[PDB]
């Protein structure tokens, strides 16, 4: 991890699986290489393949002179070693939920939009509900997800039909019942609904 850094905040999925049958041979596989000489910690999602002998103070080296080791400890995986020395093929699947034109989708079938209120909209993993009326907003082609004055799913591009539409949420609010006194009259209450007729 000092030669392959994964950042703390940004995500990924660690997929490792044992290969004692495949990548572990009793003569050893010295093709699977491994670095140990590196000046400082390595930046996340980066690498440096360069096989250069490093001087710890910093000098142009020439191996095998003093303090000019090769930067590699190339391990040969045997099929007779313990579990801590078995070869593991490790695939790290980083993701991008950065809302570009949505590339890697899921197997869900795509329905069609309705202007009607309160639709469980799922525009590329953006769940929720609301009135889904089309509107007139500019939407440059490098911006596909508009927000409110402070941070909400407000306006999206329909990723199939490339249409501009904003979301008003479902018509919430308080409900205020209005009664005369029940000892005076248990007659039926009248009610608000705090939105609209």
């Amino acid at each position: 991890d000092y030669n392959y850094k994964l950042p703390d905040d940004f995500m990924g999925c660690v997929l490792a699986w044992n290969t004692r049958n495949i990548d572990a041979t009793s003569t050893g596989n010295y093709n699977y290489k491994y670095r140990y000489l590196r000046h400082g910690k390595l930046r996340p999602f980066e690498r440096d393949i360069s096989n250069v002998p490093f001087s710890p103070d910093g000098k142009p080296c020439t191996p095998p002179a003093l303090n000019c080791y090769w930067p590699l400890n190339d391990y040969g995986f045997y099929t007779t070693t313990g579990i801590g020395y078995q070869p593991y093929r490790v695939v790290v699947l980083s993701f991008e939920l950065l809302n570009a034109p949505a590339t890697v989708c899921g197997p869900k079938l795509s329905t069609d939009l309705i202007k009607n209120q309160c639709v469980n909209f799922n525009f590329n993993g953006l769940t929720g509900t609301g009135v889904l009326t089309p509107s007139s907003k500019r939407f440059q082609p490098f911006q596909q997800f508009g927000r409110d004055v402070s941070d909400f799913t407000d306006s999206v591009r329909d990723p199939k039909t490339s249409e501009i539409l904003d979301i008003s949420p479902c018509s919430f609010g308080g409900v205020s019942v209005i009664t005369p006194g029940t000892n005076a009259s248990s007659e039926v209450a009248v009610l608000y609904q705090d939105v609209n007729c």
């Binding site: 570009a100 907003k137 440059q140 490098f142």
Partner: protein, 238 residues
């Protein structure tokens, strides 16, 4: 090829301001009538911006340190500064992405390169024809490949005020390379004018490399000559 010109004059590091430049859309988000805050890497207003005036005698593209992100202005009515190499030390040991244009198509490609000490295309001064690539020769342990769309370019030398302007911001961020396009018409002699313009994102290059240094690539009008079309560099700050 390692073909250096004879009359090559070093830069004097002429300082100018970053007046109202280096502003980009920080995210893929439509925002309307809001006074929104953002802490990303940005070019500060009124910074020390290093100039590089490539007149017929003075040839200016040194190996400039990158340092957490750069701004790149280019006064180009003449379309000269066509190419960048973002490497660690720009040797055959380290990896260097090369972002050039072959006057019809932008090429982004990252590998180990033996870097030329002075690369240029064999381009005549009145005609402006791109014939011989002299930028990459050797390419081994290569990882990244990209070839863009097609759109034409005028290589030849214009005159008077600059009819275009090339604003760029490169960010080494999370093992990527964010590229930001700047395209506006101006009218100036050699100065970087105090003009505001917003940049758009174009490339999110999934490379992942220690970028410490860089060098711009000049399309020299070839014992050589260049137009009065300078370029500027500035750094970014969080």
């Amino acid at each position: 090829r390692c073909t250096t010109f004879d009359d090559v004059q070093a830069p004097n590091y002429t300082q100018h301001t970053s007046s109202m430049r280096g502003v980009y859309y920080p995210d893929e988000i439509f925002r309307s009538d809001t006074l929104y805050l953002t802490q990303d890497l940005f070019l500060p207003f009124y910074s020390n911006v290093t100039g590089f005036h490539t007149i017929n005698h003075t040839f200016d593209n040194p190996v400039i340190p990158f340092k957490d992100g750069i701004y790149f202005a280019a006064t180009e009515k003449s379309n000269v500064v066509r190419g960048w190499v973002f490497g660690s030390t720009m040797n055959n040991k380290s990896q260097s992405v090369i972002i050039i244009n072959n006057s019809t198509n932008v090429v982004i490609r990252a590998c180990n390169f033996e870097l030329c000490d002075n690369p240029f295309f064999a381009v005549s001064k009145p005609m402006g024809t791109q014939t011989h690539t002299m930028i990459f020769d050797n390419a081994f342990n290569c990882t990244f490949e990209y070839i863009s769309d097609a759109f034409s370019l005028d290589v030849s030398e214009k005159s008077g005020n600059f009819k275009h302007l090339r604003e760029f911001v490169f960010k080494n961020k999370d093992g990527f390379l964010y590229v930001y396009k700047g395209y506006q018409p101006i009218d100036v002699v050699r100065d970087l004018p105090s003009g505001f313009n917003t940049l758009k994102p174009i490339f999110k290059l999934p490379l992942g490399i220690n970028i410490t240094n860089f060098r711009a690539i000049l399309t020299a009008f070839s014992t050589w000559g260049t137009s009065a079309a300078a370029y500027f560099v500035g750094y970014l700050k969080p």
